[PDB]
Design a binder for this molecule. Structure first.
Ligand SMILES: O=CCc1ccccc1
Ligand SMILES: O=CCc1ccccc1
Ligand SMILES: [NH3+]CCc1ccccc1
Ligand SMILES: [Ca+2]
Ligand SMILES: [Ca+2]
Ligand SMILES: [Ca+2]
Ligand SMILES: [Ca+2]
Ligand SMILES: [Cu+2]
Ligand SMILES: [Cu+2]
Lengths: 720, 718
């Protein structure tokens, strides 16, 4: 029998286009670009003919297809974008079965508990050398597949390691003084607790709210304040900031200011309620989904690749032009780009062994009761991988993108497949190079970039990360921010009201009775670059103006001060965009005798004002707990266990267990395996243009080959 | 009948044949046509068109009526271009006006026989009247006038002509002003050198067996208060030479330490400076691919089958909420004028005029052949004149519309530059997004309208993009590519004896070739009128202040706001961590905040950033060009102050540009301000940039700040 074509294809997630003049359907879905005419015995898939067992049938202006059409067409093989992996890559993320296997192993332990949740279940990384050998030499990794299983028993963290190959538990280590990240069920627990609190209902009522059932809570981490916040360090707590649901789909626009409830999770009870001055809840409807807006007419624009893509995805490995890399998903930091090599005329040269988001922080600058503790570590305390937002096909990524599904474990240890978790797409990026010699034929070539995009939403903020592989060897990493701002309810409607000045001391008045509290967005990327090998050195090149000592009219010259940065301590520094910092390989040179290197650029621009460091006095704890905030460049000795800038267990941490810890011994960085950490951020002073919803703002970082090659990388294959 | 593919391609249209669909897809600029052989109708931008003669297949060769292109492409179904019934007052001089102006000055008894024209451009009507035309359709009751700047030998004369009444209004010789370099000067230099026995003698001394293979370059000499031993009153140019080896890239073969000084009026070398002899790098280094084979790539197309979202009426461009005027100038290229943002039905002023102000590419090597090297490409060579036609689909995306522009050449004859400017819309990620947990997603795509212009002066190719974002933001990017200026050296690798000395002022990017360090400094003149003429410059510096409200916090994040009341204070370095606004103290948004635009001189770049001029304050280039050392300048609107480097920068003895425009330190309080943004890079070369440099970009931004009352892209309320 058959089924309606449009409905079915839309359900399938394919774009359906009908050309009445040509009597032709054009179907697009990831790497598949299809053309089919009603009644035709064949269809075209990426330029190749495909025989259909059932032609598309047109009835009374309605098209119908066989129930096997989607499978026969989209899984024909003529779409070669995806290929089957014959030999499993050692860095492949844990499969659904493996996740379940790990969960069974720990549950076989006599110590496992019923309320035991899983903060993270991820592959235990085999030794770096074995992995590189596999990627380059194709040598098998004779080491057993293992998995780290981090459990949360009540409020206690337990680190267990399971041997998946031999289905046996290898370790069970409780981690004292460590708090666990926030889990999904905590979100519902908070709302439930507030709903059952007689006092809170009373607190809310005196603040103008009649129906407490319309109150929406949010689970915020409290941080650490040596007790000044009056909170027992031992307990698993969360502060609750509330909003009123007015039915406009945007409760963020209706803050219940000066009301904070402290909740003890294991005790499932409100242990404290801080109250400040009563501020009337901003009530005006402020929808952002367009319900109250007119839809402007816009002409269609399509980016198409009718014969398929230039990249191939074998398993989790992506091949594109001279690039080869592995892409996997982690519940905490999201995407991980591994074993990155650049094919130099037949020879695959190492570039980066492992790269990913290190961690990030969004600290606010308002001292009041509902803001002073607010300093989010989104990936660390909330798991950005877990909170991945599926790509909106054609909107969050260009129409010519390919969308990948990714699987991770949820907090209960059950496999979870995130649909459209990552977008991959090639894009035109202007001319690669050009030269119009006067009176001569022009010379131009277009530039192409391969983008790997991932979006994660943690509450009100929506973050976008793009890993950009330039055909010329350059690698870019951009971070975009959008979503809804965290606002403060105030009494002033305009800057002319009496309280305006005081209401706007820590933020801009972006709407009536609404202030966009000033804050920063500080991102950090962990980049284990192995420039043409593991042993590298950090070199500095500072352009300077020195007195002319060669005679002639000039009083000055442009020269460069070059020196090595031999230790981690000296490598942790602010970044001057006017200087040059290289991660060189002192063991290999290019054709001119220069060490093959990559230029590290932590700050390549941004659309919001740039964060020169953490906007905190040096005597604030957040500044103390988190040191990665103040430096834009860090370089440490390779260590498989050092992966997070804010530390492994940042929730209510008492001291820096991250980059401050990784570089505290000030080890040598001379001709050894280095790991680069780039920190880049923005300072956000709000404006009306960003409310009710904020246009995407971006920050850019860059990694450029510096004498890594012997000439223009994109000139092409040498004819003679 | 006539062959389709042959005719269509001569027309410049792209032809695609789909055998499965038996359909031809024809594309050219805003027209997207679909036609099947034998069909009595065709489709143009989604609309049906009746054909007089169907397309016919003859021996697998399609044929069309001899009137096909006109009937289809000029049908009217492609609405990209609309007729301009009332000419915009800022329209550039037409070919007829260029010839009229030349006839007017040539009729004067003072016009000498071989006089050339450095520039022939529209003399701008008063701003007020122009705004009234754009906002009120009010006619400009002032005759079209043209500035005619002549070069009589080496003497500059400024004339003004009344085009409407066809009469000469003024004729003023400009004392001590040197004229820019003109095209014929390039040939003179080469011919003068070619006929120089002494030069040929010097060249032989340096290993060149055939002097006829020597390629010259016309370089401005600057000013060094005589220390360079050059006569200030003479029209001079220094000549740096290269050896043509037949690889199509003479730039890769420098004849180091050989500099000839040519007096253009005497037409002869008046000085030859010789330094140590360095063997000419000989290895062929073509950049045009003659020795390469590109990897096969799958096709990519960006299509708009229903036409464009923008309309071009004459030179007026309408797109979404934006409306602006695009014109061409021989010196600075494109000019963006009368820019307004249609705020829910009401057009609000944003920028009266915007364009490249000027730029300079100064080097940091003290040696004989480099110390004077400081290029003012627009000012001294005329970048609009040297516009490089856009290579369709490569220099600009496949969905772009390419515009032709007309200017006058140095002999006063109209010159049409094909594909001089590219206009194209592009996807730029999501405009905004919010995925509320467990709720339906909300995402809208971002669209940007780009106006791209490319100019090439010698070895460098410069790209400029004026980017209009739907949300009111305006971006201005500058890209650099082309061939690097290199110094011939003895070292082949860094292991050679002279390596250290050879690389003191630049990187060794090839054997015996050093890419001398230099900077790229661009300056943009932006006459912003934020929702009106009268504005004020306001600073907002984010600062950390002690907490005085109580609680655990010791510090807070506050802003230090203050006005910058005068030109001298407005001339400043830009801290990308601070905020600088051009506000309209007379208008506010719904929250009582002054409608403003955020000025961002530095929004990013792919090359190291230039914090200022890499020159000691006692260097003459530094004294002559103050604009290089500050990223932000704000001056009072004046019709005759348009160039950061001054009107006549060739061998100038002092700053007649921004240094002069602000020397007076006038008030910037609630008045007509003009913003000048200086953004630059410091270029330290690498092997990856040779023989041809992959495009490097710098970015600037102008963002609406409380100009609107909410997210500008949400749309009108139902
Ligand atoms: O995103 C940071 C903490 C948070 C989590 C959930 C809702 C609001 C805020
Ligand atoms: O671009 C600056 C001066 C110049 C002009 C012509 C050829 C080479 C260099
Ligand atoms: N007075 C305008 C200049 C002009 C000259 C000749 C034809 C058309 C226009
Ligand atoms: Ca260490
Ligand atoms: Ca490394
Ligand atoms: Ca002035
Ligand atoms: Ca102005
Ligand atoms: Cu923000
Ligand atoms: Cu350069």
């Amino acid at each position: 029998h058959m089924v309606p074509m449009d409905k079915t294809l839309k359900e399938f997630g394919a774009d359906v286009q009908w050309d009445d003049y040509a009597q032709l359907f054009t179907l697009i879905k990831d790497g598949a670009y299809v053309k089919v005419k009603p009644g035709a015995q064949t269809a075209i898939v990426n330029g190749q003919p495909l025989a259909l067992q059932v032609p598309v049938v047109m009835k009374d202006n309605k098209a119908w297809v066989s129930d096997t059409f989607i499978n026969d067409v989209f899984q024909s093989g003529l779409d070669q974008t995806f290929q089957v992996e014959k030999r499993p890559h050692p860095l492949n993320a844990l499969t659904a079965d493996e996740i379940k296997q790990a969960v069974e192993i720990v549950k076989a332990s006599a110590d496992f508990k019923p309320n035991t949740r899983f903060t993270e279940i991820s592959l235990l990384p085999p030794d770096k050398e074995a992995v590189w050998a596999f990627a380059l030499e194709n040598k098998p990794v004779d080491q057993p597949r293992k998995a780290d299983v981090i459990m949360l028993d009540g409020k206690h963290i337990i680190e267990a390691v399971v041997d998946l190959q031999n289905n046996k538990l290898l370790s069970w280590q409780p981690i004292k003084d460590a708090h666990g990240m926030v889990l999904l069920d905590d979100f519902a627990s908070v709302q439930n607790i507030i709903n059952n609190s007689e006092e809170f209902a009373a607190a809310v009522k005196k603040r103008g709210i009649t129906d407490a059932k319309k109150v929406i809570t949010t689970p915020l981490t409290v941080g650490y304040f040596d007790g000044k916040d009056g909170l027992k360090q031992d307990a698993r707590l969360l502060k609750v900031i509330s909003y009123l649901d007015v039915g406009d789909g945007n409760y963020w626009a209706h803050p219940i200011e000066n009301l904070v409830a402290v909740v003890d999770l294991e005790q499932k009870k409100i242990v404290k309620i801080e109250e400040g001055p009563v501020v009337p809840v901003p009530m005006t409807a402020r929808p952002f989904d367009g319900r109250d807006r007119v839809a402007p007419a816009v002409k269609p624009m399509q980016i198409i690749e009718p014969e398929g893509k230039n990249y191939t995805i074998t398993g989790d490995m992506i091949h594109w032009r001279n690039w080869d890399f592995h892409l996997s998903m982690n519940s905490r930091v999201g995407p991980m780009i591994s074993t990155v090599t650049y094919n130099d005329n037949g020879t695959k040269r190492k570039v980066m062994y492992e790269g990913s988001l290190g961690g990030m922080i969004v600290p606010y600058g308002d001292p009041d009761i509902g803001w002073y503790f607010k300093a989010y570590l989104d990936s660390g305390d909330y798991g950005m991988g877990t909170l991945t937002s599926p790509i909106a096909r054609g909107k969050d990524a260009p129409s010519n993108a390919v969308l990948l599904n990714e699987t991770i474990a949820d907090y209960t240890g059950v496999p979870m497949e995130i649909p459209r978790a990552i977008a991959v797409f090639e894009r035109y990026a202007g001319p690669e190079y050009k030269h119009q010699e006067m009176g001569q034929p022009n010379v131009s070539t277009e530039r192409r970039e391969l983008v790997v995009r991932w979006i994660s939403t943690v509450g009100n903020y929506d973050y976008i990360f793009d890993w950009i592989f330039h055909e010329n060897g350059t690698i870019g990493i951009d971070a975009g921010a959008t979503g809804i701002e965290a606002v403060k309810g105030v009494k002033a409607k305009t800057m002319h009201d009496e309280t305006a000045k005081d209401d706007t001391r820590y933020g801009t008045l972006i709407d009536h009775n609404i202030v966009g509290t000033t804050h920063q967005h500080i991102y950090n990327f962990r980049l284990d670059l192995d420039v043409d090998g593991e042993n590298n050195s950090l070199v500095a090149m500072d352009p300077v103006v020195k007195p002319n000592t060669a005679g002639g009219p000039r009083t000055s010259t442009m020269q460069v001060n070059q020196y090595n940065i031999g230790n981690e301590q000296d490598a942790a520094q602010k970044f001057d965009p006017g200087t040059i910092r290289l991660l060189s390989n002192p063991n290999k040179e290019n054709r001119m005798g220069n060490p093959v290197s990559y230029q590290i650029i932590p700050y390549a621009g941004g659309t919001h004002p740039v964060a020169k460091g953490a906007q905190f006095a040096p005597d604030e704890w957040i500044y103390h707990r988190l040191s990665f905030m103040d430096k834009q460049l860090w370089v440490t000795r390779y260590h498989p266990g050092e992966r997070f800038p804010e530390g492994k267990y940042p929730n209510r941490s008492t001291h820096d267990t991250g980059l401050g810890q990784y570089s505290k011994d000030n080890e040598s960085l001379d001709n050894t395996d280095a790991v680069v950490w780039m920190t880049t951020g923005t300072t956000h002073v709000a404006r009306a243009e960003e409310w009710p919803i904020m246009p995407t703002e971006w920050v850019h970082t860059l990694l450029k080959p510096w004498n890594f090659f012997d000439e223009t990388p994109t000139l092409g294959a040498l004819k003679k």
